[PDB]
Amino acid sequence: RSVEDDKEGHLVCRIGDWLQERYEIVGNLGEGTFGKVVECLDHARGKSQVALKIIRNVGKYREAARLEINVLKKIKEKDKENKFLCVLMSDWFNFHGHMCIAFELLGKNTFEFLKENNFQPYPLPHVRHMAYQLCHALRFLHENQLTHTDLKPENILFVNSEFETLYNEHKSCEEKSVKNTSIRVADFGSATFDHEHHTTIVATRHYRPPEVILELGWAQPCDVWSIGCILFEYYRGFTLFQTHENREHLVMMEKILGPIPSHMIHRTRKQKYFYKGGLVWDENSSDGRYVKENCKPLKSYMLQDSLEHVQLFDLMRRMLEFDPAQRITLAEALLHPFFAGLTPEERSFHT
Numbered sequence: 001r002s003v004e005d006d007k008e009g010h011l012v013c014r015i016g017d018w019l020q021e022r023y024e025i026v027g028n029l030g031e032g033t034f035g036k037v038v039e040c041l042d043h044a045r046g047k048s049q050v051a052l053k054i055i056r057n058v059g060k061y062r063e064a065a066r067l068e069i070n071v072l073k074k075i076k077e078k079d080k081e082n083k084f085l086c087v088l089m090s091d092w093f094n095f096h097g098h099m100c101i102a103f104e105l106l107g108k109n110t111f112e113f114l115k116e117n118n119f120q121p122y123p124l125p126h127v128r129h130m131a132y133q134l135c136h137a138l139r140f141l142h143e144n145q146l147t148h149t150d151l152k153p154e155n156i157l158f159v160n161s162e163f164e165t166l167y168n169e170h171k172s173c174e175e176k177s178v179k180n181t182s183i184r185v186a187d188f189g190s191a192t193f194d195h196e197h198h199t200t201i202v203a204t205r206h207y208r209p210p211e212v213i214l215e216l217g218w219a220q221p222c223d224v225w226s227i228g229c230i231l232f233e234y235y236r237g238f239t240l241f242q243t244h245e246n247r248e249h250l251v252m253m254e255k256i257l258g259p260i261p262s263h264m265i266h267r268t269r270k271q272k273y274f275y276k277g278g279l280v281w282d283e284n285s286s287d288g289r290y291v292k293e294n295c296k297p298l299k300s301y302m303l304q305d306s307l308e309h310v311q312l313f314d315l316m317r318r319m320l321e322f323d324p325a326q327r328i329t330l331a332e333a334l335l336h337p338f339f340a341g342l343t344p345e346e347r348s349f350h351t
């Protein structure tokens, strides 16, 4: 009957509340800028578990959620079998101006698992299987003229995030290892079809490619850049580009990956970042000092020198190509030698 929302537009709601007259809230799953996610029991479909994304009562976010519902439904029509690992939408509705999307309940997202593991990195076999799945899911989207644009660890969910705790003797610390590394891709609120208007700036800043910063236009290679940043973060446990400002971000890119190719510099209208073909920046700023203290060349972040590690870094570097026309495609990444080390079960998604 009566319903309340806060000045930020979120729905005020506690455990035990019902929505429509079928979803009963039984836990909190997290909250973004979009709204909240809550675990609900579906009293219309067997008292079964759904995750319920409750969107803020704000124009911008309602709109993004209508867009997301159109993507999700188009995806489930293109993939009736669920073979391409996108979260499965079971229902949607409008609850007093809050768009609500019901999803099949999954475990922790890959960021939260990492955070609860004190940011100890995923083991390489896990990184490999997660990479394979992301590549598979996104390659599917890509070939259906879709680009996600907001890939990041929080938008990647474990199907089941149950773990075992081992004791690591090198690190003199306990360590959690997820029992099943099957994942799903979430959050299509920013997903853009080839034929739709492309906003100048997309992606969360840390996962944002240089073509976006340099306003060179973007398309599917944007997601491949994001994936490379994500694999790094899974493998080291910290963010590759821990940045909050464009100039600083470009400096990190150069320091981690080498010079921005001169042809992208010629093409950009953001010439304020350059002078005589070189990036311009204040080395004495807190931003400058931070990047000089902390950003080193990609290869130096490698933890082990064995082949499987060498190959991950070859893959990552091909995903972090500056030029989006030369950046590896996901179709091509799926053929990369790094993936030879998957088990047959992993390769066939029987996990």
Ligand SMILES: O=C1N=C(Nc2ccccc2)N=C1Cc1ccc2c(c1)OCO2
Pocket: 029, 030, 031, 032, 037, 051, 053, 087, 103, 104, 105, 106, 107, 108, 109, 154, 155, 157, 186, 187, 188
């Ligand atoms: O589309 C989304 N965007 C999400 N963002 C998010 C959700 C919780 C914390 C931080 C970010 N979550 C979903 C969907 C989702 C779908 C199934 C789930 C779930 C979340 O939590 C566990 O089950």
